[PDB]
Structure formats: C-alpha cells, structure tokens
C-alpha cells in the first residue's frame, strides 16, 4: 500500500518561534483518532513540498514521572521536491519504537520567509 494521507495543495505560514501558533502541513493525535496508517508495520512518511524545511514530529507529552519526548527528524532523503521521513529514523529519535504512548504526530514547517506548500503526503510499507 501507498496511503494517501493528503492530497491537494495546502500552504503553511511560520515565521517566527514568538508566534501565536506552529502549524502544521499535516497532524494527528493517535489517543483521540483512528490511525490512517499501521505505526507497528515499516513505514515511510513521503511529503511533496516547497519552500521551508520540513520536519517530523512523534510526541508523548509528560504523564507522572515518564518525562515529556519530543522527537522532531529531519528526512532520511529529499529528492526532486520529496521528502522521505523513515520508521528507523523516528524510533531512533523516540527513543524506541514502542509508539503506545504516543499522543501526537506532526509534519511541520521550520520558521522561513516563503512559508511551505504540501501538495501531497503518503505513509508506505517497506
């Protein structure tokens, strides 16, 4: 499978970490909807855009004494204007690819001039 997670054209505006707000070309919260794609399978994350770079987030917040991560991956590879976030890179900056604690997913812009356009995101099997 090659699921399609976005499709379209969806431009994202961030400029500045005072902001009121850091958006995202894409978002999930795995506790509060069901998963488009299978976290325990190998998967690629490939995003279609332009301008600003772009980064990929999985966050478990703090809970008691398990402390807060936030594991933030440049891709493993852009080509011809697609990035390739991979599971390995991920579970490497989560710390273990253990994803039952996991409370969000984002794709997300680094601050820049132009902004950045998404015209398509696909999650894929390995």
Request: overall charge negative; hydrophobic content about 40%.
């Given at each position: ?9 969806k431009h994202?505006?961030?400029?500045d970490w ?10 999930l ?15 690629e994350?490939?995003?279609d855009?332009?301008g ?6 999985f966050?478990?917040?703090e809970?008691?004494s ?26 490497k900056?989560?710390g273990?690819?253990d994803?039952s604690?996991?409370?969000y ?22």
């Amino acid at each position: 499978a090659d699921i399609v997670l976005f499709s379209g054209s969806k431009h994202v505006e961030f400029t500045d970490w005072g902001g009121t707000d850091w958006p995202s070309a894409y978002e999930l919260q795995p506790p509060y909807q069901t998963m488009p794609f299978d976290l325990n399978k190998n998967f690629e994350i490939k995003v279609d855009y332009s301008g600003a770079d772009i980064v990929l987030i999985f966050a478990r917040w703090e809970h008691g004494s398990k402390p807060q991560i936030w594991a933030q991956i440049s891709p493993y590879y852009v080509v011809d204007g697609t990035a390739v976030f991979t599971k390995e890179q991920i579970a490497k900056a989560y710390g273990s690819d253990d994803f039952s604690d996991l409370d969000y997913i984002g794709v997300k812009p680094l601050p820049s001039a132009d902004g950045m356009t998404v015209t398509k995101i696909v999650a894929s099997y390995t």
